[PDB]
Write a protein that binds this DNA or RNA. Structure first.
Ligand SMILES: [Mg+2]
Ligand SMILES: [Mg+2]
Ligand SMILES: [Mg+2]
Ligand SMILES: [Mg+2]
Ligand SMILES: [Mg+2]
Ligand SMILES: [Mg+2]
Ligand SMILES: [Mg+2]
Lengths: 117, 21, 141
RNA sequence: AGUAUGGGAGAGGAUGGUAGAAUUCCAGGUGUAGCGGUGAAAUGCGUAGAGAUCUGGAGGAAUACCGAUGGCGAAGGCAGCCAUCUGGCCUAAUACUGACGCUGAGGUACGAAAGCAUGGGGAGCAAACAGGAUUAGAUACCCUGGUAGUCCAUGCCGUAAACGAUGUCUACUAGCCGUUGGGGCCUUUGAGGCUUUAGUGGCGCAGCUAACGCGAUAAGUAGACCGCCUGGGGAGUACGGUCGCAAGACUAAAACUCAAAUGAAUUGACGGGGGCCCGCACAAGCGGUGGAGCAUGUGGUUUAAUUCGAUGCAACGCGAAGAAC
């Protein structure tokens, strides 16, 4: 395998779904996992319970590269944002730095209207 | 996130009035 | 209750051995207010166990009971539609109650001539490490 | 009331240049089975290679924190940074002209958004439109796409809950607590403290008011001038007239009909409005029903009749503590 052993983590967080992606510092992807692969298929994906499952599945996939140095970067609000951290701590990975990399727009485009119902 | 074109004036003023007391 | 806490009920010890644990075990075995048949079952099981190895019955009973006792149990706590299985600590009374219940029903599942004989057999099997009562107790799950 | 001198603050206005973040698109690296979306789903996207991440470009709009009880402007309104031009305001007293002032029917200027005309631009959002859900029905709220429009330059339109629902100017009339721009005094001994102006806020005496409330920023006490009202609907409507490319804008009745329409406050009731408390109501334990056979009551169907009542909890082993005559 690659045996780079320095793959960082990209835990994308959303209200509807949970996206997990682990890649090297350069950005060439190694492995990824989401709630949809596990078979939830609906609002159950929005629940935080599938987030740690997808994260630990991505960790099992990363076991092939034998990587154990992590940098966690999260984007977006919603439940399941922190469950991936507990997952990657339970599997036994070492994490170098922990921070939020959510993007804030500086006077971006006009957002959509508010939902009345 | 959403659009509020001028209603932040209302919300800021009322939150201020609450914070005064 | 919502306003006041209720104290636990006091159980008189058994007449033969003056042990409260044996009394609670007989109360757990008893059904439909038939205390006499449960007493006969428990006493026959105790005597049959004592005759195999001449040991004072109450101490052996306590030692074989504590070995099958659990310490933690799972709570169903729904948060956002997920099960959220979680371990909980509970006081020794709740744990010894479940221990007695598991011992009783595992003894009932056995096939023997009478209830006393199968109870003594399950007691010996759980004491030596091959019974089904100890298999019922799963801490990892 | 105004002029000259020396200082201060400010998203006041017009023109030009320039910067970052974020969204979309165009390729490229690795990787690739679901992604998107909902109270639940589906329309939609993807093995051509989805979604996530990294690197380089293109274009459009707005300036995250600072931001505030701010500030400026006659009002509408004005917020990234820099340059040019320009208006008003505050502040110290020295000199100056000596009533040169207030208001103002007609008139004139400015005037949110939407809309209209000409020529460009178009990232995101999104009238009209299409598709999928829910509903007895959905024409709408919900979701997926999306054209005018939102942007720029030159013009038109002149309407808003254009509100402080309070016309402009002047003088007087208890206090307490904050803030913005200046000046003076005390020990600038230290961002300190005390007084004088010009703005902007919160209570409150007298007084006013039907009440709510206003109360030196009056809705108090007085003066100058203008506009506007005379029960509700018809109706800001018809006709006429002026303006406008159009949409329409302004001025503005009557016939008829009713005996009411209204403002503030009080007591109940209700709320798919908010908090606190209690109950074998939830939590724990034991034993049942729902499945089988039979007894009994009810609903339906049949018959000549299957006598009549009781009908969510609070009717159904109920009237009936007992129909072979
Ligand atoms: Mg005038
Ligand atoms: Mg006039
Ligand atoms: Mg008007
Ligand atoms: Mg008016
Ligand atoms: Mg007052
Ligand atoms: Mg008209
Ligand atoms: Mg009856």
């Amino acid at each position: 395998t690659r045996t780079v052993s320095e793959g960082v983590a990209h835990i994308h967080a959303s209200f509807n779904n949970t996206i997990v992606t682990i890649t090297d510092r350069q950005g060439n992807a190694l492995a990824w996992a989401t709630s949809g692969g596990q078979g939830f298929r609906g609002s159950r994906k929005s629940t935080p319970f599938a987030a740690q499952v997808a994260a630990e599945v991505a960790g099992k996939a990363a076991l092939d590269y034998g990587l154990k140095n992590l940098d966690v970067l999260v984007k977006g609000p919603g439940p399941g944002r922190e469950s991936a951290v507990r997952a990657l701590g339970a599997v036994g990975y070492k994490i170098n730095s922990i921070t939020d990399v959510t993007p804030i727009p500086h006077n971006g485009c006009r957002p959509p209207k508010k939902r009345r119902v | 996130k959403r659009e509020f074109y001028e209603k932040p004036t209302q919300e800021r003023k009322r939150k201020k009035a609450a914070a005064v007391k | 209750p919502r306003r006041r806490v209720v104290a636990a009920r006091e159980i008189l010890p058994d007449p033969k051995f003056s042990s409260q644990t044996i009394a609670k075990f007989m109360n757990h075995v008893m059904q439909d207010g038939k205390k006499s048949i449960a007493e006969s079952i428990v006493y026959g099981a105790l005597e049959r166990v004592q005759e195999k190895n001449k040991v004072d019955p109450v101490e052996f009973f306590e030692t074989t009971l504590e070995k099958v006792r659990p310490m933690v149990e799972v709570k169903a706590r729904r948060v956002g539609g997920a099960t959220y299985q979680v371990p909980m600590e509970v006081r020794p009374s709740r744990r010894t109650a479940l221990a007695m219940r598991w011992l009783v029903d595992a003894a009932a599942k056995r096939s023997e001539k009478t209830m006393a004989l199968r109870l003594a057999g399950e007691l010996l099997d759980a004491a030596e490490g091959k019974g089904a009562a100890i298999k019922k107790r799963e801490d990892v799950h």
